[PDB]
């Protein structure tokens, strides 16, 4: 519960030529710059996405929660990304049908108790349907505002 | 405790069996399953949402419903005969772990056999040490549901009697032992002592005598 | 490949202290969680406690009957786990196991802090808490006779009587005789001591020629007995 560090440049819009590896690069990059995670953090996130996919077939737009073991995280951090086109992420529950994804929540948590709590709260925010509709229109400066307000409440 | 299991369950070889674990915390958390063979440390079988470690047959599978968890063996084999334990949280919101009462799985795996009974009177060396112990050996029987009775002459005795629960031998049959502790005077003052073994409606009685 | 070895078990007087160790080989002990589980003889498994990795804060948790009395400490430098038992009571008599603890959390149907399972188990160390003192076994012969025989095969053995605490290991002819040997589980007599039997099935023809010796080993008393079993 050692605080989820958030900055402005931890939110960015991604172009249309991005694949699954391109996303994990762009979202991790600010986290390794600020010493949040190890140098090869994108490697360990990609490795876990191959073994445990994080595609979520939520309505109306699917999402992905790419993360890794808390062993490769120095400080708790979050990185957000919005995609211009739906990118295929494999289903997390096991259905062979993939999931189109436009919003991606890279989670960088450092200990097991924080992974279970943040992941549980994430399940509630993706069910905020009227919020899953406005995430695709807010720009990189404002997406901060709404999404950071729900981080400052977690300290409860 | 919080988690409750069926004490004993028996299944025919090659058929399906379900072991159930009931607890309040199962409405919030999954349960893992552990198989313990006699004289061996436990081993993990099913954990989480039907996750199975490498080297575990695919006939093992877990499930969950309300406040109950289930371990299903499809087509039970002789190697699956062991004790099974469920493990989960004690209550909701806790970081402690709690095991279930345990379930003894009996896989009826091979044909029925009548028990062979041998009764050992007290040795001369033991009587010369002011002690007397009758040793009754029951071996080579299947299934392992026997009852042992002792007799001083024609009257039964239960005090000073202790019997080990039947255990499997090398030939995959069952064996057990029962003891009667006597004083040397008790041994000399009766005409005979008897060890009755009952296995599926069939009783076998061995008898020893001090004058023999 | 994964190996967990426990040690330090023995007889302890009620109210005494005992420390157990656990040697971990075959994985990254620094990152794995570690649990202690005990099993009283003839009873079920009971969770004792668990220590987290230094990554996850190194927190420790204990069951109610052992909280405050038992303490779990790890040593990543030498890949060893420790269980310090203080104020031991009769109820603590059990085989203590050392288990590598795994973590699990289902995203769609899981509740924090998730579920803990035990992947690899050590062989276990026996702890006996009793005011009764150590006692070496008495070995009496179970000789066959012209009535105890069953045709071509005969049953002979030894009665390992009055010893404390467990265990007792039995062999026949210095391990050269293992065909037909069966050693029964111990039994608790009226004195509070233990007794068991070891019988070997033997051809009746070789009862006057071949000699039979049962070898009894009771390490908690440092006693070894070789008893000759002759017929009649």
Q: Which of C50, C115, C147 sits opposite B48 (nearest CB)?
A: C115
Return the bridge partners of C227, or none: C214
B126 and B191 share a domain? yes
Among C225, C95, C212, residue whose Cα is nearest residue C162: C225
What domain range includes position B157?
A: 110-212
- Fill in the DSSP letter of residue A28: H
B105 and B1 share a domain? yes
What was the structure determination method? X-ray
Neighbours of C19 (CB within 10 A): 13
Structure tokens at B46: 């099913």
Return the bridge partners of C61, or none: C50
Task: Give kind and range of the element (H or E) at residue A130.
Answer: helix A129-132
Render the burial of B135-168: b for 16+ CB within 10 Å, e for the rest: bbbbbbbbbbebebbbbbeeeebeebbebbebbb
For C31-82, give the secondary structure using H, E and C.
CCEEEEEEECCCCCEEEEEEECCHHHCCCEEECHHHECCEEEEEECCCCEEE
Which CATH superfamily, name and number, covers C1-131? Immunoglobulins (2.60.40.10)
B36 and B128 share a domain? no
Q: Look at residue C196 and give its three-state secondary structure.
A: strand
Which residue does chain C place closest to A71, by CA atoms?
A: C55
Q: Is the Cβ of C123 closer than 8 Å to some Cβ of chain B? A: yes
* Of the residues B59, B84, B109, the one at which a domain ends: B109
Q: Which of A71, A93, A116 sits opposite C114 (nearest CB)?
A: A116
Cα–Cα distances (Å) from A62 to A52, B58, C18, in that order, read 16, 32, 56
B65 and B151 share a domain? no
Domain annotation covers residue A139 = yes
Burial of A89 (0-12, 13-18, 19+ CB in 10 A): buried
Among B64, B59, B49, residue whose Cα is nearest residue B11: B59
Q: How far is the C-alpha of A22 from the C-alpha of A106, rounded, in Å?
A: 13
Q: How far is the C-alpha of B33 from the C-alpha of A153, rounded, in Å?
A: 38
Distance of alpha carbon C48 from its chain centroid, rounded?
A: 17
What sign for the dihedral angle of Cα A33, A100, C110, C31?
Answer: negative
Which of C34, C50, C53, C55 to mutate to test binding with chain A, by most A CBs within 10 Å of its CB? C55
Q: How far is the C-alpha of B197 from the C-alpha of A25, rounded, in Å?
A: 75
What domain range includes position A65?
A: 8-152
Q: How far is the C-alpha of B85 from the C-alpha of A103, rounded, in Å?
A: 42
Distance from CA of C122 to the nearest CA of B (A): 7
B90 and B6 share a domain? yes
For C36, list phi and psi in degrees, rounded to 5: -115, 130
Structure tokens at B66: 């309300």
Q: How far is the C-alpha of A149 from the C-alpha of C219, rounded, in Å?
A: 66
B7 and B63 share a domain? yes
Q: How far is the C-alpha of A92 from the C-alpha of B108, rounded, in Å?
A: 41
Burial of A106 (0-12, 13-18, 19+ CB in 10 A): buried
B2 and B104 share a domain? yes
Check which CATH number belongs to the domain holding A39 and give it.
3.40.930.10
Contact assignment for B137 to C197 by CB distance below 8 Å: yes
Burial of B39 (0-12, 13-18, 19+ CB in 10 A): exposed
B100 and B160 share a domain? no
Cα–Cα distances (Å) from C17 to A98, B146, B167, C21, C87, in that order, read 58, 42, 35, 14, 6
Region of residue B150 (left: phi > 0; alpha: psi -120 to 50; beta: else)? beta
Which residue does chain B place closest to C104, by CA atoms?
A: B48
Among B10, B34, B38, residue whose Cα is nearest residue B167: B38
Do the first three CATH levels of C1-131 and C132-232 match, i.e. the same topology?
yes
Structure tokens at B140: 């080579």
Distance from CA of B179 to the nearest CA of C (A): 9
Burial of C190 (0-12, 13-18, 19+ CB in 10 A): exposed
Contact assignment for C117 to B85 by CB distance below 8 Å: no
Contact B145, B197 (CB under 8 A): no
Which chain A residues contact residue C105 at CB under 8 A?
115-116, 119
Contact assignment for C124 to B41 by CB distance below 8 Å: yes
Among B115, B43, B48, B23, residue whose Cα is nearest residue B84: B43
Burial of B103 (0-12, 13-18, 19+ CB in 10 A): buried
Contact B147, B201 (CB under 8 A): no
Q: How far is the C-alpha of C229 from the C-alpha of C212, rounded, in Å?
A: 6
For B151, list phi and psi in degrees, rounded to 5: -135, 130
Contact assignment for C105 to A92 by CB distance below 8 Å: no
B77 and B173 share a domain? no
For C116, list phi and psi in degrees, rounded to 5: -115, 125
Task: Look at chain B and report how many structural domains it folds into.
Answer: 2
Q: Domain residue spans in chain C? A: 1-131, 132-232
Residues 6+ apart with CB under 8 A from B29: B88, B89, B92, C110, C111, C114, C115
* Of the residues B74, B109, B144, the one at which a domain ends: B109
Contact C47, A61 (CB under 8 A): no
Which of A52, A56, A116, A117 to mutate to test binding with chain C, by most C CBs within 10 Å of its CB? A116
For chain B, give the secondary structure using H, E and C.
CCCEECCEEEEECCCCEEEEEECHHHHCCCCEEEEECCCCCCEEEEECCCECCCCCCCCEEEEEECCEEEEEECCCCHHHCCEEEEEEECCCCCCCEEECCCEEEEEECCCCECCEEEEECCCHHHHCCCCEEEEEEEEEEECCCEEEEEEECCEEECCCEEECCCEECCCCCEEEEEEEEECHHHHHCCCCEEEEEEECCEEEEEEECCCC
Contact assignment for C45 to B96 by CB distance below 8 Å: no
Q: Is the Cβ of A113 closer than 8 Å to some Cβ of chain C? A: yes
CA angle C80/C97/C112 to nearest 5° reads: 85
B62 and B132 share a domain? no
What sign for the dihedral angle of Cα C81, C87, C88, C92?
Answer: negative
- Fill in the DSSP letter of residue A147: H
Domain annotation covers residue A2 = no
Q: How far is the C-alpha of C161 from the C-alpha of C191, rounded, in Å?
A: 11
Contact assignment for C112 to A117 by CB distance below 8 Å: yes
Q: How far is the C-alpha of A79 from the C-alpha of A12, rounded, in Å?
A: 9
B159 and B170 share a domain? yes
Q: How far is the C-alpha of C114 from the C-alpha of B93, rounded, in Å?
A: 9
For the domain with range C132-232, which CATH number is right: 2.60.40.10, 3.40.50.2020, 3.40.640.10, 3.40.190.10? 2.60.40.10
Which residue does chain A place closest to C105, by CA atoms?
A: A116
Strand arrangement, sheet containing B146-152: B155-157, B146-152, B193-199, B202-208
Which chain C residues contact residue A115 at CB under 8 A?
105
Q: How far is the C-alpha of C18 from the C-alpha of C86, rounded, in Å?
A: 7
Contact assignment for C161 to B131 by CB distance below 8 Å: yes
Return the bridge partners of C102, or none: C117
Q: Look at residue C176 and give its three-state secondary structure.
A: coil
B105 and B139 share a domain? no
Domain annotation covers residue A39 = yes
Contact C126, C145 (CB under 8 A): no
Check which CATH number belongs to the domain holding B58 and give it.
2.60.40.10
Among A73, A135, A150, A70, residue whose Cα is nearest residue A102: A135
Contact C49, C36 (CB under 8 A): yes
Which chain B residues contact residue C59 at CB under 8 A?
95
Q: Which single residue is written with the structure tokens 């990185």? A: A79
Work out whether strand C45-51 and strand C115-121 pair parallel, antiparallel, or are unpaired. Answer: unpaired
Q: Look at residue C144 and give its three-state secondary structure.
A: coil
Q: How far is the C-alpha of B182 from the C-alpha of B189, rounded, in Å?
A: 11
Task: Look at chain A and report how many structural domains it folds into.
Answer: 1
Contact assignment for B129 to C138 by CB distance below 8 Å: yes
List Cβ<8 Å contacts ≥24 apart for C105-110: C105/A115, C105/A116, C105/A119, C106/B30, C106/B48, C106/B49, C107/A65, C107/A92, C107/A119, C107/A123, C108/A92, C108/A93, C108/A123, C109/B49, C110/A116, C110/A120, C110/B29, C110/B30
Return the bridge partners of B43, or none: B35
Q: Which of A70, A92, A123 sits opposite C56 (nearest CB)?
A: A70
């Amino acid at each position: 519960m050692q605080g989820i560090h958030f900055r402005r440049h931890y939110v960015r819009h991604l172009p249309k030529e991005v694949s699954q590896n391109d996303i994990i690069k762009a979202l991790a990059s600010p986290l390794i710059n600020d010493g949040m995670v190890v140098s090869d953090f994108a490697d360990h996130v990609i490795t876990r996405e191959q073994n445990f996919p994080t595609g979520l077939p939520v309505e109306p737009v699917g999402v992905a929660i790419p993360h890794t073991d808390g062993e490769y995280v120095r400080q708790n951090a979050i990185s957000v990304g919005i995609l211009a086109e739906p990118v295929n992420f494999e289903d997390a529950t096991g259905e062979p049908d993939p999931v189109p994804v436009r919003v991606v929540f890279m989670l960088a948590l450092s200990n097991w108790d924080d992974i279970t709590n943040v992941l549980y709260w994430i399940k509630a925010v993706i069910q905020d349907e009227d919020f899953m509709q406005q995430l695709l229109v807010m720009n990189d400066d404002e997406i901060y505002q709404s999404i950071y307000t729900r981080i400052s409440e977690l300290e409860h | 405790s919080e988690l409750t299991q069926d004490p004993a369950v028996s299944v025919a070889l090659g058929q399906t069996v379900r072991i159930t674990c009931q607890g309040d915390s199962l409405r919030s958390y999954y349960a893992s399953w552990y198989q313990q063979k006699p004289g061996q440390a436990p081993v993990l079988v099913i954990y989480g949402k039907n996750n199975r470690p490498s080297g575990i047959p695919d006939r093992f599978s877990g499930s969950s419903s309300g406040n109950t968890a289930s371990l299903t063996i499809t087509g039970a084999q002789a190697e699956d005969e062991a004790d099974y334990y469920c493990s989960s949280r004690d209550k909701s919101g806790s970081r402690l772990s709690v095991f279930g009462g345990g379930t003894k799985l009996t896989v009826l795996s091979q044909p029925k056999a009548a028990p062979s009974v041998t009764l050992f009177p007290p040795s001369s060396e033991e009587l010369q040490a002011n002690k007397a112990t009758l040793v009754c050996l029951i071996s080579d029987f299947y299934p392992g549901a026997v009852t042992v009775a002792w007799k001083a002459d024609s009257s039964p005795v239960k005090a000073g009697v202790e019997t080990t629960t039947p255990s499997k031998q090398s030939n995959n049959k069952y064996a057990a032992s029962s003891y009667l502790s006597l004083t040397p005077e008790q041994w000399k003052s009766h005409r005979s002592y008897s060890c009755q073994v009952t296995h599926e409606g069939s009783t076998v009685e061995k008898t020893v005598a001090p004058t023999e | 490949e994964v190996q967990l070895v426990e040690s330090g078990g023995g007889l302890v007087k009620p109210g005494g202290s005992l420390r157990l160790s656990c040697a971990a080989s075959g994985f990254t002990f620094s990152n794995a969680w570690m649990s202690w589980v005990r099993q009283a003889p003839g009873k079920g498994l009971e969770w004792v406690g668990r220590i987290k990795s230094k990554t996850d804060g190194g927190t420790t948790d204990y069951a109610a009957p052992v909280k405050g009395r038992f303490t779990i400490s790890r040593d990543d430098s030498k890949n060893t786990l420790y269980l310090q038992m203080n104020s031991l009571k009769t109820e603590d008599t059990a085989v203590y196991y050392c288990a590598r603890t795994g973590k699990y959390y289902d995203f769609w149907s899981g509740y924090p802090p998730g579920e803990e399972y035990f992947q690899d188990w050590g062989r276990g160390t026996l702890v006996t808490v009793s005011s009764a003192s150590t006692k070496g076994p008495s070995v009496f012969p179970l000789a066959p006779s012209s009535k105890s025989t069953s045709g071509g095969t005969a049953a002979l053995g030894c009665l390992v009587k009055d010893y404390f605490p467990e265990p007792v290991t039995v062999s026949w002819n210095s391990g050269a005789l293992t065909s037909g040997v069966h050693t029964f589980p111990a039994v608790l007599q009226s004195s509070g001591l233990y007794s068991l039997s070891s019988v070997v099935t033997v051809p009746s023809s070789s009862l006057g020629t071949q000699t039979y010796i049962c070898n009894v080993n009771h390490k908690p008393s440092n006693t070894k007995v070789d008893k000759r079993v002759e017929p009649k």
